[PDB]
């Protein structure tokens, strides 16, 4: 196209990466389950963190 320096390889997106709008939610889910596991008894947290 266009004869411009745009070349086929410039259009191949990275599928093995992880989008930040997600990565943010991973760091959050850690904080989430870690909060909710302190709401239980020390053995329920230990047994659930173990399983």
């Amino acid at each position: 196209g266009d004869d411009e320096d745009s070349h086929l390889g410039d259009f191949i997106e990275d599928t093995t990466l992880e989008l930040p709008l997600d990565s943010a939610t991973t760091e959050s889910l850690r904080a989430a389950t870690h909060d909710v596991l302190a709401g239980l008894t020390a053995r329920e947290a230990k047994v659930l963190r173990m399983r």
């Binding site: 390889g9 410039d10 191949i12 990466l17 989008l19 709008l21 943010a24």
Partner: protein, 1332 residues
Amino acid sequence: MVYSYTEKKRIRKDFGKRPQVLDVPYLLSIQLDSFQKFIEQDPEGQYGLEAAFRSVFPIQSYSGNSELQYVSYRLGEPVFDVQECQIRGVTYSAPLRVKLRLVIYEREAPEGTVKDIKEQEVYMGEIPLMTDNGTFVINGTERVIVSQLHRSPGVFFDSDKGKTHSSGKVLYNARIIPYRGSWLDFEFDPKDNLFVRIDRRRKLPATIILRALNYTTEQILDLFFEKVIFEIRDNKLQMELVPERLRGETASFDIEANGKVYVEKGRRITARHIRQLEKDDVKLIEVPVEYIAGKVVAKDYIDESTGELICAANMELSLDLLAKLSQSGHKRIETLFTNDLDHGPYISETLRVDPTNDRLSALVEIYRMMRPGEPPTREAAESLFENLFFSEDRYDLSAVGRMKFNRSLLREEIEGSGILSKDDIIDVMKKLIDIRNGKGEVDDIDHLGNRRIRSVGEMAENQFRVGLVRVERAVKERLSLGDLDTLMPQDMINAKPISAAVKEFFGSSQLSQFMDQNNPLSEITHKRRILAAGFEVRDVHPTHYGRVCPIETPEGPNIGLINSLSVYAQTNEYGFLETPYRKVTDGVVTDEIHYLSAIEEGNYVIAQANSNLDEEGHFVEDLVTCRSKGESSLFSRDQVDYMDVSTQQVVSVGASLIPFLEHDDANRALMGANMQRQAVPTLRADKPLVGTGMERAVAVDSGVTAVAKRGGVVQYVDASRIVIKVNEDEMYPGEAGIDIYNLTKYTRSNQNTCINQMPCVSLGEPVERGDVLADGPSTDLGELALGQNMRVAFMPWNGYNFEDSILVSERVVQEDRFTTIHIQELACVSRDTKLGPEEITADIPNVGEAALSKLDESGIVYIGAEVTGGDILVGKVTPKGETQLTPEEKLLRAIFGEKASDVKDSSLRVPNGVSGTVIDVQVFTRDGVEKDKRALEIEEMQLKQAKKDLSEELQILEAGLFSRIRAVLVAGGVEAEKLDKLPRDRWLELGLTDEEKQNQLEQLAEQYDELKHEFEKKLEAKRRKITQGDDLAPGVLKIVKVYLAVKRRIQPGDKMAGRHGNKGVISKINPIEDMPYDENGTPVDIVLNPLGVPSRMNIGQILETHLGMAAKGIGDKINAMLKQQQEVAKLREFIQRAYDLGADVRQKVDLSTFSDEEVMRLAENLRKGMPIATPVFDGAKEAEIKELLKLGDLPTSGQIRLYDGRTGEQFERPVTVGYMYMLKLNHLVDDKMHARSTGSYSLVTQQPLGGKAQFGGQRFGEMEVWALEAYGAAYTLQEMLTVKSDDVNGRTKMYKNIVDGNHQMEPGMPESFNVLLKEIRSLGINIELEDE
């Protein structure tokens, strides 16, 4: 003639004086005519497949006396028809079946054949076909091939003065450009040495080619120079004197003969002395022995006794050399005639720089020039030189090349050999030297006689030619070793080689492009288009008159590199551009038309399109403005040979549609004709209120509308089809008939607009042949409506109209008049991956019942279901196994007990923000995979729908035929009530008394049964085409194409413009309450800023407003008398008054029209407004406009009082209000608008890239970096080129901080530079980052 049936519906009031002698021809002529010449059976070398065949044929093997000749060709029926070919995606093409004859001559002949096998019509390739509208379908998409403009083959003599060497002196060069084969260039130098180079290669002394033609030095001087005869008679040097030789020279000695001294020494020889010598007939004079010291000897001279060469040809004689050749008995010495002014001694000095001697020497030095470095050989040099310009294979000028060649050389024969001859080369050199001598002139490239026009037909022939040469090598190669009777002309000729030459052109070539169809004018202005470097070629040339439009060209990187074809222009017989003209004999202007090419028109004196003649057509004025040779001035009454045909012929279809064009500056006029092609069609086809009269022609000539094949009365009118019962005078005897027009309904255009036809006629109405049956998109009752005219007011309104910005009343969007319908084609592909096949199944992980609602059991949205952004059009799921989740996700599924599927969701969903209704679904399936439920339902529907259509054909057709049988049976055997009782099927038995009517019943019988079976075969074929598995790409199992119809109205950001080049972007949509209104209380639709009018000089936009206002008046008035229901008399009276308008116009008019049914219908169509026609340069004048405003009841000033709808108070000064035609271009704001937060990223270098059609971020350029550098903003720039883009880490570390509420950046290094380090380090360069 004298007015058609759809002309009785509405008539355009036409100002303008000049009567039209010629009416606009078919606008699509070029495209259709060209292709018509390519594919056709022509029994001769006239351009076509026949000609391209006859060139390379017959093909004989190598010395083997095995020859393959060509018989005839045929085009098989197309595999798919035009409509079907578009859906599937294949090309619309026909098989090429060519009969070949294989002869084998007995080895060691007398020439005779052992056996000759005639192979019946071997198939080579499928060549595309042109639509009835002049388009091609390459892959499912209508594409147009633009005609090209290039330098005509022939010889061309140029200057190259100025810039070279900066010494002046100019230069003179000739160039021989063949249609095929190498270029032959001749050129001078500052030393007046003639040089030659083949193609652009190394410069070589000119004479070196003559030697390769086997010409010795003696004949070169003898060819290019005259002979000065020197006689040694008695003793010491006499000389022959042609008395003209003394012009331009001063006597070098006593010029005396016949005992009388004519000229003394030191007296220059003027016309007086020459007369004396001429009239006294002085043949021989006495000259000194020293005058030949400079004279170059012509031929060779040897010593008769010693047999040794005294002096070689082309040597300057000296007083000592004269002695050595005199005692040998030489009476005569021939020398060159050399004059530095009249006849130049150029060739003589060219020979002294020539390194070669004989033919082999030149051939050696020539062969080593083209292919240097390799050792030359005699047979190699001979072969090369004969293969360049002398070989019928590698060189052709064809007809145009040879003609202009001979024509520019002042020859007689207009046609000749297609290769170069020694006579030809010599003549060209002669002409170049003559120009350098001062007699003759150099051509110019810009002249339209040297510019030839190709077109689809000519171009395709070349590609097919290329295909045949690459197949030729193969055929000879096989016929080399061939066994006698086993092989035949199939095993040799392949398909793929020839087919790929033609296929590579139409498929991808700079001249083959998507038709620009958002607009009928766009189509027709695309199909007429030309293509051709510095400013010389871009600029407008005097020869462009009547051929190329001066004002329609793109404004941008290529200006004047495109143009467009003029209105009346036609391709010349030889391929030049010729234009219509009127032959003026004696003092009368004769209406016989005459077509003159670019060179033909040159010498004649041509009058002006605008001129005054009368009665017999004698020029009124004693002198009239005319143009003769490349310039225009006043010319005497009776001199003029010809006159311009029409006032329009200078412009193009685009420019010819601008009313009052003569009043607009060319810049804005260009932009206008440039923008008019972008007008998207509207929901309600309106009509131009102000017009030219081309709009009718553009609408009809373009295929967008549906034109009557034959005249008659409408039998049936449906929004789908139209059936016309033909008149008997127009009807053919057999089959009887009716014409059935199947209308195109709502469907996707190339630009995603809506192209839909509407019936413009009513049940049982008389229609005449060549009448508009149905309007297309953006056409109204046979005229061309690219938009909708509306009430406009010029005044600054609180800055909302600030630059070009347009402020539009809410009334416009409420009336839904500028609303536009877009049809978008969305696709869903079920592919094949190594992990597994993708399913179109309706079972999608993680979607609610509301999501899957709009889908059927199969997973495809129902037809007609209205959707918005995000809705699932097609359910699709692809296998991805062993997800490999993490600890906390595993707990999540554990708590909520969800089984995470082995399949990932690929389903096709509606793009963000776009909302519409689903109008169609297509299912393509691989051959061999089972069609799912929905796909089968579609196939069944298509089957039933097909049967209904075909049956409809047969039903209406059969009745049409039997209705004729009823009429013929009543002649000769009339029984009226008796005949229609018995079953219609039993009618065919009754015969007739001896007459042709018995044979007429016979005719109708034959054709009846034919239809019965023709229907049958057509149904079968259609059914097979439905059920046959469509061929898909490798890897694709099935494809689902959904068609959405979005209806967008108008919103701030859309581009809008008038025909006069005034752009605009709608700013605010204002309530009707705030709209300026007049005393009568009627608000105004649009408020334009007046400030745009004076700067950009377009005054027509004002005139267009004024006349428009007046037009609406005549409309409004009728609307009152029709609402009064006065009577036919009052109405008739008032309308007649309008169509006359005070004096001298060409309109004529009524009282021939039927006073009741025809007149009342016309007025109903005029009540919206009175259509007016302003011819391009013949258009109306202020006075005519003011008078129409008098009839209008509206002021002459064109301005009235307006009141602000807010304060209700008046406006100081009157403001101009009227009706301007305005187009909606398609830039519409909800396309251009894009925004991105965090999208996908490119793999090779991590950078924002749109993969979802969620667009990649805006491109931040170098210039913008400077802008940040000028400000003190360092951090904005770092974040711009590091964290916001290129830093694969910094981006995520940033995003997390943005949600946490900490605005910071932990920048790191952009990955781009990090790659440059490895790329440098990949070489032998050690690049490190030092210190700390």
